[PDB]
């Protein structure tokens, strides 16, 4: 997938906007632009508003302005993206016509929603029990363990939804660069992995100190707060409400306290495993490829739909990989998720990731494994043998804040 | 601002305030602002502030929120950077620690006057009787930012009724590369989209 961004940052022509005029700079030496067409498209939230096609006439190391028709100006609330393509109609020895050398994307504008949530006629029907928490609202029922605090089980009907509670992770199946060139044997401390075994990131102890579940005119909420421990010293400390309404959404809210004097985690979010296992994913986002938050600059912010497969990098050396970022609308299923965040989704849990030295040797599991981020740590590469993640990338700022929502059709 | 919604429910621990606003201008939605009181058995509370800011309009100056005291206190005290004025992109001469002045010196008598005097990273401020608690910057004067920015002279400024107090979750930063072009760098600028900040009320 690094490629694409190596495309992408290489590219023979820049583009700077300023109104709803457009400015072309060549970066050729030599050649005029003669094999080249640009398109515009304008969007509303992944909606085609307007398209257009101008063909480009710079001369090495030039300008060219393209001036806009004039642009529609939406009401409905969302997202308005500018987005350019440049295209060559002929083929060439190396390329066939059609060939896309260079793009760009603007944000044009946003509209904020405003509108309030359909009344009810019912509100969901909370449970009490020795072991967990019940709340229904009609075919629909969520399970909250009592002892775990977590959303341990859910269904819709009389199918059950999860393989595997949803909880906080703060881990991530160590990337190449993660690892440095740290051996069983030759252990470097400096590597991000050895920080994170070290720290015991990796096998801390989350500890339930509260759970709460109250009903109220228009919903029911839930209530909790975990700690992570290791040996004595607590990491983190994860914040949650949930909250289920009437038309049966179920509204996540997480927030969470990383110690100062522990490594930087390398992921603030949740995951579960799904026991349903659709063909395609469908996202509103950054995409389609695999991006990181170091490394997105070559994604374009759209509505994308790949099939599962798809979302799985084969890296021969197996780690975390798949995330997308900045997605704010997910929809695998019969489920649908919409906040902000970044996500990835397969067959391996990280674990196994984690656990298998070769690609050849992974298998599928169960369901789906979701890993859904509030925010996710850079990959880094300035190179492979020492810490190379930058500043900007490294989740520092002590207090993370996140808001999920979660629902069905 | 414009009330979109504000409810309340009693809780088995405690009531629970719930609203958010939409500040609108001509036609337009700038920011939506939601929170949720709590009040517990303590007497304690809780506020929570989760704010959006439409991606096509500048960058706001700040994101918190003010309200005019009655109370007047000879000192101010308080956990945070100190003991000086500081914003976002100044502040490397501050230190961490407890300060207690006059509320006198909370006030930086700029010849020509404006926002002026916010201490940053602060976990715990008191005042009087009220005590608030969380993470945020804050200013502490007898002047309104609506008297600051209308008065053009320090001399013609007066005190207010009672002491104005400005708690923000974020603040812009000052800049100041040259004082005739913006010159705030991006990382000091309010341009993420969505902020939330916590805040604790109470009194003793």
């Known amino acids: 997938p690094a490629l694409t961004e190596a495309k992408h940052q290489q590219q023979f022509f820049q583009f700077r906007l300023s109104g709803q005029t457009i400015e072309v700079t060549s970066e050729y030496l030599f050649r005029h632009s003669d094999n080249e067409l640009l398109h515009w498209m304008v969007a509303l939230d992944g909606k085609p508003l307007a398209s257009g096609e101008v063909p480009l006439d710079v001369a090495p190391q030039g300008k060219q302005l393209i001036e806009l028709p004039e642009l529609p100006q939406p009401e409905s609330a969302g997202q308005l993206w500018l987005t350019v393509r440049v295209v060559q109609p002929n083929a060439t020895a190396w390329s ?50 009592r002892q775990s605090g977590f959303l341990s089980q859910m269904w819709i009907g009389d199918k059950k939804q999860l393989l595997t509670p949803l909880r906080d992770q703060f881990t991530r199946a160590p990337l190449d660069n993660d690892i440095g060139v740290s051996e069983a044997t030759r252990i470097d401390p400096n590597a991000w992995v050895e920080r994170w075994k070290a720290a015991g990131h990796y096998q801390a102890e989350a500890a339930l100190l509260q759970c709460t579940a109250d009903t109220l005119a228009d919903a029911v909420l839930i209530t909790t707060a975990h700690a992570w421990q290791h040996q004595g010293k607590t990491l983190f400390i994860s914040r949650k409400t949930y909250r289920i309404d009437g ?132 990959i880094g590469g300035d190179d492979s043998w020492s810490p190379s993640v930058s500043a900007e990338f490294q989740l520092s700022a002590g207090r993370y804040h996140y808001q999920l929502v979660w629902c069905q059709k």
Not at 98 to 123: D, K, M, Y
Not at 130 to 142: A, P, Q, S, T, V
């Open 247 to 378: 038309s049966g959404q179920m509204a996540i809210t997480v927030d969470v306290e990383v110690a100062s004097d522990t490594p930087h985690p390398a992921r603030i979010g949740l995951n579960c495993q799904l026991a349903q296992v659709a063909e395609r994913v469908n996202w509103l986002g950054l995409g389609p490829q695999e991006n990181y938050p170091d490394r997105l600059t070559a994604a374009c912010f759209d509505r994308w739909d790949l099939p599962l497969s798809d979302m799985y990098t084969p890296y021969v050396f197996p780690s975390e990989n798949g995330l997308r970022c900045g997605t704010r609308e997910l929809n695998y299923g019969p489920h649908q998720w919409r906040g902000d965040f970044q996500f990835n989704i397969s067959r391996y849990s990280q674990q196994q990731l984690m656990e298998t030295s070769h690609r050849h040797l992974l298998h599928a599991e169960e369901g789906t494994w979701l890993n859904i981020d509030g925010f996710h740590m850079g």
């Open 96 to 145: 066939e016509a059609g060939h896309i050398s260079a793009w760009q994307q603007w944000r044009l504008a946003e509209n904020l929603s405003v509108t309030l949530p359909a009344a009810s006629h019912a509100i969901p029907h909370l449970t009490t029990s020795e072991m967990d928490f019940c709340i229904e609202l009609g075919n629909k029922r969520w399970q909250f363990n």
